[PDB]
Every structure is written in structure tokens, then in C-alpha cells.
């Protein structure tokens, strides 16, 4: 945010007003910090969809980022027997939230304990790798010589 409390607006290529929302959460530094539950400001595809959805359904809300960056998976903690849902999935299933709007995948492991909506963007998995140009000029007069 800007020092005024909010973060300054802006405009799209068409000069359209980008919606933004105030979202608290992380320590401003996850790796090394005690905690700093500081106010931030969010805006994104999901934020637009949330805005439209709420206007269509008369909500009122407040967004806060997750505590530890992880999406979520099942785990048996140390020094106990109860296997626990990690991360954001846990922040939902414990009682800290009432909904999870994010790029969340769909698979039966999650679908045991949560209810899913219909999909709102289809996709898959794929691999990324760096692209390299370099030519192979080396003693051009000498290599065939």
C-alpha cells in the first residue's frame, strides 16, 4: 500500500479502473521474520471474479493471504498420531475461512473433505525449459581444415 493506507489506483490500456482490495496476511517476509500481519492490497483475475460474484449474491468480506504459502496436502505431524491437512486447505478445514478463491486444482484427494464448484478454467500440466540461441562459429577457416 501507499503511505495513505491504500495503494494508488491505475488504469488499463483502455484507461479502465483496475479494481483493487485491501488484503492483510503475511509478515511481509516469510523466510525470516517473527510475524508482521501487515495490510497489503490485492488485485487479480480471481479478484475480478470475486467482485462480480459478490455483487451477484450480496456478500461482504475481507481477504487475507495464507500463513505459510503452501497450497495444501495431507501430512502426519511429528510427535503425534493425528494426520493433518497442511497449509491453506487446513486454514479452510479448521475454521479460519469460509471459502477459498485461488487457482486450486481438482482431485479426489482434496474432494474427500471439501466441496468443489464447477470448473471455471480448464487446463493441464506441462514443462518449462530455457531457450538457447547460441551459434557454433569456432575457427571457421580451421574447423574443416
Amino acid at each position: 500500500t501507499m503511505s495513505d493506507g491504500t495503494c494508488k489506483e491505475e488504469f488499463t490500456v483502455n484507461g479502465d479502473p483496475v479494481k483493487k482490495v485491501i488484503c492483510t496476511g503475511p509478515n511481509d517476509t516469510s523466510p525470516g521474520s517473527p510475524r508482521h500481519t501487515v495490510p497489503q492490497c490485492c488485485y487479480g483475475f480471481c479478484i475480478d471474479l470475486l467482485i462480480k460474484l459478490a455483487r451477484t449474491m450480496q456478500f461482504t468480506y475481507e481477504v487475507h493471504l495464507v500463513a505459510d504459502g503452501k497450497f495444501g496436502t495431507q501430512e502426519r505431524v511429528q510427535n503425534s498420531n493425528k494426520k493433518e491437512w497442511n497449509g491453506m486447505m487446513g486454514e479452510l478445514l479448521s475454521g479460519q475461512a469460509d471459502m477459498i478463491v485461488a487457482p486450486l486444482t481438482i482431485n479426489n484427494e482434496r474432494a474427500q473433505y471439501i466441496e468443489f464448484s464447477k470448473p471455471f478454467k480448464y487446463q493441464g500440466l506441462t514443462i518449462l525449459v530455457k531457450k538457447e540461441i547460441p551459434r557454433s562459429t569456432l575457427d571457421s577457416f580451421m574447423q574443416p581444415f
Binding site: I100, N107, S117, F120, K121, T126, L128, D139
Partner: protein
């Protein structure tokens, strides 16, 4: 043609992805869905171990490490990664989609808002709303670049023979000097 790089990486069938060597590293994000998929897979266990050895904490860190040639290949979602590649730029995706699934809002069981939100999402898919969102600020806002071509001529290619130019010139100056001196002698 001979000096073409090993520019071929396919989806999850290439033997390289199955017999891992420390020349390549394939990483993902810990506690992520991809980790579930790879764990509950029968004959990819070696790959799964070698991957579990080097995973990351967030997507952005892995993107950066690939930009710095520390991580050789990255296996993450398709929409996020496709935008990140086509946009930032001079990064590329290889292979076909395999774990075809979707995204979705989540909720604890039994809230009426589930039954409402599903209908809302369908209605929104009908009005092209999602389509214009995508066209707005998902795609079409990138380093839209074409395919590859063979290498061209550069100055480092010419330097090896430009030396013979100046070398021959200085040799010719000395040679004409000494030849005229000799013709002055005999």
C-alpha cells in the same frame, strides 16, 4: 545442421524423464497437487525420489532459478506457466498436456452458497464474461514471438578472418618496403 542442440523434450514419456541424471533437475512446489499426482504413480518412483530431493517453496522462485540455469526444467500448472513463459519472455514450453483437470472454488460441505455459486459460474461462462476477462489480462499481453530459425552471421564469426586482413596488410607494407629496398640494392 550438425551443431544443433539437444532441442527435444516431450511430455511424460521420454526416457530421460525416467532415468534421471544429475545433469538435469526437475523440481516442483512442495505440498502441491503435482506432488500428489507423482506420488500416487506406480512406475515413476525413481523420478519421484530424484524430484523430491530438489523441490522449491514457491512458483516464482522456481521461475527465477530456471532463468538462472540452476533448475533445468520445471513441471507446474499450464495456465500460470504458459502466461509466465509467453509474457516475460525468451522462455518456452515443450510437450503436451497430460493431467487434464480444472480449477475451482472450494467450500466446506453444506453451504447453500455452493448450490448458488455453481449456477453463477455457469451463467458467467455463458455470457462470455470469462472470455473477456481472459482477453483482458491473461493472454494477448505478452512478448508474442514466433518459432526458431538457424543461426546467423555475427562479428565473432568474422573476427577470425579479419585478422588475416590487417595481418596481411602490415605484412604487405613491410614486404613492399623491403622489396623496394632490395630493388634499390640489386
Amino acid at each position: 545442421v550438425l551443431d544443433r542442440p539437444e532441442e527435444r523434450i516431450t511430455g511424460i514419456n521420454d526416457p530421460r524423464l525416467r532415468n534421471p541424471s544429475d545433469k538435469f533437475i526437475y523440481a516442483t512446489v512442495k505440498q502441491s497437487s503435482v506432488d500428489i499426482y507423482f506420488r500416487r504413480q506406480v512406475c515413476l518412483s525413481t523420478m519421484y525420489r530424484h524430484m523430491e530431493k530438489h523441490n522449491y517453496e514457491s512458483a516464482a522462485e522456481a521461475i527465477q532459478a530456471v532463468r538462472d540455469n540452476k533448475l533445468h526444467a520445471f513441471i507446474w500448472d499450464s495456465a500460470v506457466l504458459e502466461f509466465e513463459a509467453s509474457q516475460k519472455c525468451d522462455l518456452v514450453t515443450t510437450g503436451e498436456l497430460f493431467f487434464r483437470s480444472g480449477f475451482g472454488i472450494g467450500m466446506r460441505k453444506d453451504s447453500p452458497w455452493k448450490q448458488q455459486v455453481s449456477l453463477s459460474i455457469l451463467k458467467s461462462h455463458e455470457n462470455g464474461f470469462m472470455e473477456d476477462l481472459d482477453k483482458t489480462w491473461v493472454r494477448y499481453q505478452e512478448c508474442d514471438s514466433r518459432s526458431n530459425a538457424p543461426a546467423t552471421l555475427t562479428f565473432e564469426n568474422m573476427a577470425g578472418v579479419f585478422m588475416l586482413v590487417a595481418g596481411g596488410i602490415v605484412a604487405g607494407i613491410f614486404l613492399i618496403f623491403i622489396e623496394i629496398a632490395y630493388k634499390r640494392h640489386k
